[PDB]
Amino acid sequence: RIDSVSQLQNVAETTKVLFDVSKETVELESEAFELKQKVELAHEAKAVLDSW
């Protein structure tokens, strides 16, 4: 029974860490949307120029 208990003790703290970590990662992708539009603009500009 002690063996079961010890596992759960360590889990209780550490899971809160993962919880934060996941949301932090997601934030980076929000900012990635700004990046994505930059990628697009570069592609379009190069394409028109290539045709010229």
Binding site: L8, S30, F33, Q37, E40, L41, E44, A45, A47, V48, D50, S51, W52
Partner: protein, 62 residues
């Protein structure tokens, strides 16, 4: 001799050719600006989702 005759004749008699920028436009892609600089959508606001989630999965540890 003949070299000079051709050289002279060509150079002198043609030195303008057609060149309309407008005709060029038809043959190239148009620049138009990006669309949808849309800000991300916000979801899963409040602990409403969390309280629901703690309850929802019966197995919280087995």
């Amino acid at each position: 001799n003949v070299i000079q005759d051709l050289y002279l004749r060509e150079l002198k008699d043609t030195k303008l050719a057609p060149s309309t920028l407008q005709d060029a436009e038809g043959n190239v892609k148009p620049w138009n600006p990006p669309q949808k600089p849309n800000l991300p959508e916000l979801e899963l606001q409040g602990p409403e989702a969390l309280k629901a989630y703690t309850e929802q999965n019966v197995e919280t540890a087995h």
